[PDB]
Amino acid sequence: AFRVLKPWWDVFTDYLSVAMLMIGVFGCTLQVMQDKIICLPKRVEMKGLKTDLDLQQYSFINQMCYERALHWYAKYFPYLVLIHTLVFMLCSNFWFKFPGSSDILYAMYVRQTVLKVIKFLIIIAYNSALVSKVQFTVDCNVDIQDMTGYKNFSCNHTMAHLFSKLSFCYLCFVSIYGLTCLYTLYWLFYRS
Amino acid sequence: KIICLPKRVEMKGLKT
Amino acid sequence: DLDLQQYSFINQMCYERALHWYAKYFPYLVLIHTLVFMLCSNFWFKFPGSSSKIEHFISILGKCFDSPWTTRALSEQAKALFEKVKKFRLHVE
Amino acid sequence: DLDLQQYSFINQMCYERALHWYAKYFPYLVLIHTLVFMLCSNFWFKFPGSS
Amino acid sequence: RQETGIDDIPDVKNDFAFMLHMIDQYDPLYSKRFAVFLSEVSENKLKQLNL
């Protein structure tokens, strides 16, 4: 009812989904507290380089360039991972959450496996390009003059590199999950 | 927190 | 003569670049490795194929030790348990 | 005329250099001693062979 | 076999032998009690008792 319906590949998929869920929530929190862009006006014995910008202007610049520069995928990566893991969990548990299904069962399971495989394929295909997109440093040329007087700004994102680190490992996890499904897919198309 | 600044005005800061 | 924003920016940059990665990841690294140890220890029981044999052996050994007829022989209902004993001996051999 | 950053830097440096290690590590040392103690005491029950 | 004078229970397969070694490491008396049910003469006697 709860345990016998878990083959070893199913247990592996469930545990991988659990681990990637904990990764996703961890990233979401890290965004919650430490995700803060930090910006400075770019274009200018050694002395200081005082820019006579009071605190409020620094905050406004931070937010303006944080929206303008930092990539949307870079911003939403933790949300992305969390949403994908919730979708994986829900599509795994829908086999028993469906009131009717509590040979159409086999077709529903095949459809769920195909959905998981396609999700893995799409995730890999777009993450391959997107992972390199996030950068630690960043440059924004935003017309903020008449408000600070500067126009070219260099910023850096606190979690960026950290995220990329985690992101890289995340990629591998996805492949593994797909491979597991692949085996199950083979079990669905080699033995019938 | 709507963050606000005054608007109408090598470069330096714009100490207000 | 450096404002606060410059100081925080300097902290962020020099933290990412200068400070070595091992210092930045040592606790998570150790945590990962101890998880690997715990998982490799637990997989000996989390693998159902051998887990069935292990659990059946636990049950049969507990029943056989609990049987007072064993000690009596050392000097009733266990007759039915003899069949389970022989079946387990043959199968898990 | 030292900005706050220099004060924190001085605090941390003189913390690591001057202040003796006993003050820094005394609580953690106490934790390790206590954990060794109650583990050794409980090992009488935790050892299955005599359990 | 030398203790209870029972010549049955000669040996066991690889799995049983290793897992018996594990049990002995845990508790030899558990091995002693578990061995009894392999004795064929014991089964004959207990079948006679049931009869």
Numbering used by the authors:
A (entry chain G): 16 to 59, 95 to 152, 256 to 345
B (entry chain A): 51 to 59, 95 to 101
C (entry chain F): 102 to 176, 236 to 253
D (entry chain E): 102 to 152
E (entry chain F): 355 to 405
Task: Give the published text.
Volume-regulated anion channels (VRACs) constitute a diverse family of ion channels that are ubiquitously expressed in mammalian cells. They are believed to be essential for maintaining cellular volume, as they are known to open in response to hypotonic stress, enabling efflux of anions and osmolytes, thereby preventing excessive cell swelling and burst. VRACs are hexamers composed of five closely related paralogues of the leucine-rich repeat-containing protein 8 family (termed LRRC8A to E). In contrast, when expressed on its own, the LRRC8C subunit forms a larger, heptameric assembly with weaker mutual subunit interactions and a different preferential arrangement of the LRRDs.
